[PDB]
Amino acid sequence: DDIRKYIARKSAIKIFNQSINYSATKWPPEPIDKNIHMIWIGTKNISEKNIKLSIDTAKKNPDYNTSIIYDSGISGHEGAKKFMLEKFQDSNVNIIDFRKKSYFSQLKQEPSFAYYEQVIAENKYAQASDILRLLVLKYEGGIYKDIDDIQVKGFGSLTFPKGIGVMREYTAFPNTPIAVTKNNPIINKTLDLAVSNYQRGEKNVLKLAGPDVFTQALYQEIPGLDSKVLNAQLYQLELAKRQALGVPLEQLTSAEKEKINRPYQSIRGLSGYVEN
Ligand SMILES: CC(=O)N[C@H]1[C@@H](OP(=O)(O)OP(=O)(O)OC[C@H]2O[C@@H](n3ccc(=O)[nH]c3=O)[C@H](O)[C@@H]2O)O[C@H](CO)[C@@H](O)[C@@H]1O
Ligand SMILES: [Ca+2]
Numbered sequence: 001d002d003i004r005k006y007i008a009r010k011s012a013i014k015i016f017n018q019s020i021n022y023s024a025t026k027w028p029p030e031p032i033d034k035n036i037h038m039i040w041i042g043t044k045n046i047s048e049k050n051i052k053l054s055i056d057t058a059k060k061n062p063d064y065n066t067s068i069i070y071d072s073g074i075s076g077h078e079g080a081k082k083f084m085l086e087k088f089q090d091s092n093v094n095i096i097d098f099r100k101k102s103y104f105s106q107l108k109q110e111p112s113f114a115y116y117e118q119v120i121a122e123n124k125y126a127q128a129s130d131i132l133r134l135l136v137l138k139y140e141g142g143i144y145k146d147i148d149d150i151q152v153k154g155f156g157s158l159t160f161p162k163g164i165g166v167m168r169e170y171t172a173f174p175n176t177p178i179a180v181t182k183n184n185p186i187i188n189k190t191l192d193l194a195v196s197n198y199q200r201g202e203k204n205v206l207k208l209a210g211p212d213v214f215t216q217a218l219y220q221e222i223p224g225l226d227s228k229v230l231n232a233q234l235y236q237l238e239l240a241k242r243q244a245l246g247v248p249l250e251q252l253t254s255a256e257k258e259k260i261n262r263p264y265q266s267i268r269g270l271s272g273y274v275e276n
Helices: 002-023 048-059 078-088 104-109 111-121 125-140 185-199 211-221 227-245 254-267
Strands: 035-039 065-070 093-097 142-144 178-180
Touching: 002 227, 002 254, 035 048, 035 125, 048 065, 048 078, 048 093, 065 078, 078 093, 111 125, 111 185, 125 142, 125 178, 125 185, 185 211, 227 254
Parallel strands: 035 065, 035 142, 065 093
Antiparallel strands: 142 178
């Protein structure tokens, strides 16, 4: 009888350790395409400050195609476009028209792009960029960066579990910078929520396609990014481990918790590359 309980416990703990060991690497990191996407749409000239930040962004990332996307479907955009072409001529920053993207014809099937056309028609360029950045990432992947952020250090070769890299939370994750694989479910979900928010006439611009919506998408697709969900998971494991050892219902070691946390900490690995 005593040998039976010893067998049952060593088998149960074996299964448990294998599961903890698997959890550390459960989502193999996926390479991010080496494109940096920045947005400057509208009719106003880019500021000399942001020209300098953008060139610095390109210099600290010589292994990347760095681009600023404008939109020729915006009335009166021509001046701003010309100014940029001349200011970035002597740099490795590429100035490109969204309308000339190879995938542009496919956007006629996107309800989110119908909303984007409404937003730019009201000259709401900052609000528009919340939708535009998701569309670019959906179709191309790569890294989206804010035009006015300082590049602290080069991105390098990035790989991320579930093909998504974000900056740690402020409770919300910022919607910049974002590193993602193309056609990523997190980006598609954010756009889906955004269509819903525009349809119902959400008036808070941040709750249309902002960090709070990006956050909801992250939590739905990867629940363990939410500390409350991850905490409930750890308590479940703590209880499962004592059940395995047949001890009354703290057993989780710091090693085991490091492994459980590893993919979710790795997703937050886009922290520290861009500032201000
Ligand atoms: C902490 C926080 O809540 N920040 C939000 C805030 O940032 P914030 O208020 O800093 O937004 P910005 O004014 O920088 O504009 C966002 C982006 O819009 C683009 N732009 C802006 C003006 C323009 O004429 N042309 C143009 O292309 C630029 O790429 C710019 O980087 O509002 C943004 C737009 O809703 C959201 O993305 C941010 O998450
Ligand atoms: Ca900004």
